[PDB]
Paper text:
SK catalyzes the specific phosphorylation of the 3-hydroxyl group of shikimic acid, using ATP as a co-substrate. The shikimate pathway is comprised of seven enzymatic components that convert erythrose 4-phosphate and phosphoenolpyruvate into chorismate, for subsequent synthesis of aromatic compounds.
Here, we additionally determined structures of a dimeric HpSK·SO4 (R = 22.7%, Rfree = 26.0%), HpSK• S3P•ADP (R = 23.1%, Rfree = 27.7%), and R57A (R = 24.6%, Rfree = 27.3%). For the dimeric HpSK·SO4 structure, the LID region points upward, and a number of residues cannot be built into this region (residues 108–118 in subunit A, and 111–117 in subunit B), implying a disordered region. In the open form, HpSK (flexible LID) presents a wide-opening pocket, allowing entry of promising substrates.
Author numbering:
A (entry chain A): 1 to 107, 119 to 162
B (entry chain B): 1 to 110, 118 to 162
Write the structure that this text describes.
Amino acid sequence: MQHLVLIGFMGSGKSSLAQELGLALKLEVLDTDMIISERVGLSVREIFEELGEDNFRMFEKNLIDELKTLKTPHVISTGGGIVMHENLKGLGTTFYLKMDFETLIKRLNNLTQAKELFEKRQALYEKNASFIIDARGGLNNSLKQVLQFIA
Amino acid sequence: MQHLVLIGFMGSGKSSLAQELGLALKLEVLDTDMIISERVGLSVREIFEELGEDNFRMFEKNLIDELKTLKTPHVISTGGGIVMHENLKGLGTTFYLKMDFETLIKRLNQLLNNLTQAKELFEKRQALYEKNASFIIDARGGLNNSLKQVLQFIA
């Protein structure tokens, strides 16, 4: 009865996979960015611009704590930066939707800096993941992997 | 020969005012979010989402240091958030384009939401801009009027 939480970079297919999982499992699907924006009454971008990252993270940390009180399992897609929270593992079973950076950017040079930055972020998702899903085979292939792990 | 640095919330009119100052003073205009986005090749929103705020703020901190080395004064419009940087005040003379919450919101929606929480946090954020401002421009009453205020303070 643990929430299934999908983490990873924006554009990795977390929302599409969350909807498919909720359908396969007959469970409700939640999106943390959607909930924060709906409550605060500003878009995620507007929240960052007008109220700042620290306030966004506060709404996010508070929402994670709130969703943990829900005993019924939900599927939960999350925004890119959620992995900075200490309370993230704790929310439920986490899945890193692992996509090669090259595909992500279409949707990086060993000797320049940006690659290291993307690698460090990946290292954070992996550190916070119960399971790593290979996203390269597409949505149905990712679904199969998730279902097999939880079964 | 100090840079004229425009700070404030998104939608306050910083971009239009910067262009107008640039024209009036015959100076070049720079935008710090545009510089960062152009270099990284990701929108600001995309940097926060893909690389996180610590990285974004690192790019921004570095850029302020680099712009300080420009001798020739530029008008510089800045992103929300920039005032978090200890190195910001020294980049040049800062102008806070002050708006109230209701005006900001009005400019953004171009009624059932409870904005009480956002308002409370916004009012606290304003003090950070005020703290970091050489001058406060009443950004409630029109571009030309704002321009007039800035020109008078600098002249």
